[PDB]
Design a protein around this ligand. Structure first.
Ligand SMILES: [Mg+2]
Ligand SMILES: [Mg+2]
Ligand SMILES: [Mg+2]
Lengths: 205, 175, 203, 97
RNA sequence: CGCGACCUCAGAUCAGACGUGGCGACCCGCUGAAUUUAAGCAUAUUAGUCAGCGGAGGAAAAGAAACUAACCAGGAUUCCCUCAGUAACGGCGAGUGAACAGGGAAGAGCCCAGCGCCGAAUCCCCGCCCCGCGGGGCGCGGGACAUGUGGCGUACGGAAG
RNA sequence: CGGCCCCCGGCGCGCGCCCGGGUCUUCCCGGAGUCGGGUUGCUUGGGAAUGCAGCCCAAAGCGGGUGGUAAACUCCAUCU
């Protein structure tokens, strides 16, 4: 069955696969079924923003992706605690809440508090009949538009710094080299062994 | 014994709880005078005997109960078995009465499995305190002995006779 | 107050008081029929932490289940196939015996809805479970909107579909790395999606 | 001079101090619950393996006692914890007398 | 000896409800091959598929972490694209074979037992009515349920006072 | 396009229901023949055992589970 210089191959067709076949013939039909499920969901709700609540700034895990910024799930009660809004009030203000999320850094904590107060300062509420607590006159003169598009406060905006130009000085052109990588990597794995021989000379008397 | 259970049910008789017939007119009699005088406190102490194992248990370990009548024939016996051991350590006196149906008639119900005395009348304290040493002699003070005493282990009369018929032969084997 | 003791007393069932009444009633259960209506739960703390209340419409059955693994139902142990499939006698039946117990309680009483069940005894051959049931058309159940979920017709025969906590322990579902053999819905819903040829329209 | 590999790894941030989440304080003893388990182990007693254990733990030896607790209670981290609280009953039985 | 209470149970063409059976494309729970492939054949493959049995619903199932991760950390479930024919399994042969990040579709969260508190503050049935259409009630009076625990406030994101 | 007939989702008179938040102080705080272990089956890509099940043994409470090589010691992370 094999021949001249070729590829040794494993087609996974040793199983009755013509019954379990999937053809995407309804796929234009479902694209105009979930546009009409977005349009008849936009006009059904309110002047409330389409594509739902405000999402947080979130950094990705796992070395490959930890230099980018992603839209997250909720707002991690500590960030709701500092911003001053209540946890059961917040999801009818338009603010997503994920109670199982942890804040253990401070800079990424203060980023989303700045984000959450910037949202509250660009929000207009409607009283049912015009009582308006925490709210004043005509609704920002009818709120300048109707409904937003694919993100209320532009959820990614992954930004990079300027770091314009520097002068190649001493102690910078001279030290932080490949020897610093090799010695720091070796002391990372010779740490527990060297702390064992130190015990052996501590029980030496 | 039935002379002590009769005095105990006499003492527990006039502490009978509220039923729903007399719950109607009491909510009149408080509020018809509240419509007419607005009393800041008309009644200082309505006393009652508590009922329910989940109610009595919280009273004993808080030492609010003063006498714990406990039933006899609870169908899952483990619903009750801790509570004589628990009344000893919290120092609250307990007493085993015959019949979970009989003290259930005090509470206008079918069975009630435990009652407890928390707030008795002051003028009738000398009837509650008269029977408590007559009770806590037999239950609290004997707990060092009543915890050793195993039960059961007696053969039937048709087989404990033929043990004795061998022994009466053995008493004739000697004399 | 009381129910914390009943829980903790039950959790030492090798001590001499507890292993007495766990076999004075295992004798008493074995003299009755295969399924049987209990007038009341034999351990009321365990019943109500599984969803029982003491009110009209709830009903307890103790039912009896014969212990052991399954023998393969084949005449004279001859399975007629490849030598890996001669398994007549060491076969273990991937659904639990408590799940069997809840199943033939909701099969006898096809009008009742089954909530869950619990363990009240085993001998050497028989194993005794109390299955707690719900009348979905009693007005104490069809009022009270904390109980109206089970009078809704998708909860019909929850153990013939394996949806209660006895039966779902054999489905193998759960979040985690130990359970991603069933990572969409169920085991055969994953298998259909790991083995469909998802040929697109432009490919 | 921050670097990725070595012994002080990672981009340097500053830690957020926070009172910990309430789910993590779950198996603490909570003195009323201590009262319920300590009251009920004298109305109920000891298991048959842990009466044989504490009659090896007073006379026989301890390496053979834990070898008996290794087999019945499952693991080694469970066998020592059982072996030390049988020894605290055996100490309270004898030395508190 | 009689009566009573309760507890275990019986009986009824008792007053009122319920369930059975069909269809079964899709869904859930079980059960389960062999042809075939390996140029023979046992493990393997076919395949956890066909046949078998039992339950549904217009969807079903799953679903708010006893999770992933190992770093500046993410955050229920389901579907799609990639991961990837990869890690891995395998007479290490024939063959088999996931997931986590990442980009999307959609997005919603909650309740209970327990532990305490509130005079069982709770529920069902019957009778006549407030007063009604197309009938269900909050009101009134009796029978039951229920302290072996109905209801309210409470749920691990803490809670109560 | 117009007119006809029936039907639906949503304003406004009468019922029904109605003290939330913050800060401090004290008290409270959880699911067992289950986890887990051994063994035997089936299953999985899961390999010194991924899952399930039978039988036996069977918990703890600064505990338990998980951290993809069996085990002991130790620290950390994470969930309940
Ligand atoms: Mg009944
Ligand atoms: Mg191509
Ligand atoms: Mg239908």
């Amino acid at each position: 069955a094999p021949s001249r210089n070729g590829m040794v191959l494993k087609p996974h067709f040793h199983k009755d696969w013509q019954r379990r076949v999937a053809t995407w013939f309804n796929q234009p039909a479902r694209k105009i079924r979930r546009r009409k499920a977005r349009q008849a969901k936009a006009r059904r709700i309110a002047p409330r923003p389409a594509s739902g609540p405000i999402r947080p700034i979130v950094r990705c895990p796992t070395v490959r992706y930890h230099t980018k910024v992603r839209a997250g799930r909720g707002f991690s009660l500590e960030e709701l605690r500092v911003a001053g809004i209540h946890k059961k009030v917040a999801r009818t203000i338009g603010i997503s809440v994920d109670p199982r999320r942890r804040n253990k850094s401070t800079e990424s904590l203060q980023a989303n508090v700045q984000r959450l107060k910037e949202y509250r300062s660009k929000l207009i509420l409607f009283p049912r009949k015009p009582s308006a607590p925490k709210k004043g006159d005509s609704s920002a003169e009818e709120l300048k538009l109707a409904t937003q598009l694919t993100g209320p406060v532009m959820p990614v905006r992954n930004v990079y710094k300027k770091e314009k130009a520097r002068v190649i000085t001493e102690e910078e052109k001279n030290f932080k080299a490949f020897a610093s990588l090799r010695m720091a990597r070796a002391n990372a794995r010779l740490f527990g062994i060297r702390a064992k021989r130190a015990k052996e000379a501590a029980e030496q008397d | 014994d039935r002379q002590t259970a009769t005095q105990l049910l006499k003492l527990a008789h006039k502490y009978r709880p509220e039923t729903k017939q007399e719950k109607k007119q009491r909510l009149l009699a408080r509020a018809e005078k509240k419509a007419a005088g607005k009393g800041d406190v008309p009644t200082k102490r309505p006393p009652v005997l508590r009922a329910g194992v989940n109610t009595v248990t919280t009273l004993v370990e808080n030492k609010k109960a003063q006498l714990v009548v406990i039933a006899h024939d609870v169908d899952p016996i483990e619903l009750v078995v801790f509570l004589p051991a628990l009344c000893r350590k919290m120092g609250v006196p307990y007493c085993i009465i015959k019949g979970k149906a009989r003290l259930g008639r005090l509470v206008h119900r079918k069975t009630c499995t435990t009652v407890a005395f928390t707030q008795v009348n002051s003028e009738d304290k000398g009837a509650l305190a008269k029977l408590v040493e007559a009770i806590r002699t037999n239950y609290n003070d004997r707990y060092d002995e009543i915890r050793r005493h195993w039960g059961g282990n007696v053969l039937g009369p048709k087989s404990v006779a033929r043990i004795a018929k061998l022994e009466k032969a053995k008493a004739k084997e000697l004399a | 107050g009381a129910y914390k003791y009943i829980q903790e007393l039950w959790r030492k069932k090798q001590s001499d008081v507890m292993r007495f009444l766990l076999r004075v009633r295992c004798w008493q259960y074995r003299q009755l029929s295969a399924l049987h209506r209990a007038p009341r739960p034999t351990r009321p703390d365990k019943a109500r932490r599984l969803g029982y209340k003491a009110k009209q419409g709830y009903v307890i059955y103790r039912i009896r289940v014969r212990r052991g693994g399954r023998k393969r139902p084949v005449p004279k142990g001859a399975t007629y196939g490849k030598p890996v499939h001669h398994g007549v006698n060491q076969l273990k039946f991937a659904r639990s015996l408590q799940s069997v117990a809840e199943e033939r309680a909701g099969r006898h009483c096809g009008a009742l809805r089954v909530l869950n069940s619990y363990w009240v005894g085993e001998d050497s051959t028989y194993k005794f479970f109390e299955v707690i049931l719900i009348d979905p058309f009693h007005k104490a159940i069809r009022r009270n909107p904390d109980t109206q979920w089970i009078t809704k017709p998708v909860h019909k025969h929850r153990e013939m579909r394996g949806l209660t906590s006895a039966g779902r322990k054999s489905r193998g579902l759960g979040k985690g790395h130990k359970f991603h053999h069933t990572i969409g819905g169920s085991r055969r819903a994953a298998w259909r999606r790991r083995n469909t040829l998802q040929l697109h329209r432009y490919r | 001079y921050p670097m990725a590999v070595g012994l002080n790894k990672g981009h340097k941030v500053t830690k957020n101090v926070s009172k910990p989440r309430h789910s993590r304080r779950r198996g603490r003893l909570t003195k009323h619950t201590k009262f319920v388990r300590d009251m009920i182990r004298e109305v109920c007693g000891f298991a048959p393996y842990e009466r044989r254990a504490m009659e090896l733990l007073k006379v026989s030896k301890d390496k053979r006692a834990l070898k008996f607790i290794k087999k019945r209670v499952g693991t080694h981290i469970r066998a020592k914890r059982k072996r030390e609280e049988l020894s605290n009953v055996l100490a309270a039985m004898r030395k508190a007398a």
